[PDB]
Design a protein around this ligand. Structure first.
Ligand SMILES: [K+]
Ligand SMILES: [K+]
Lengths: 16, 16
């Protein structure tokens, strides 16, 4: 569900 | 690591 690869959103992990 | 919650590139869950 969405567009890309993994879970959640952005790229990487956590927040900033 | 990265920017945003959950692992990987983009938005949602899975790949495509
Ligand atoms: K961080
Ligand atoms: K992510």
């Amino acid at each position: 569900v969405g567009a890309x690869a993994x879970v959640x959103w952005x790229w990487x992990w956590x927040w900033x």
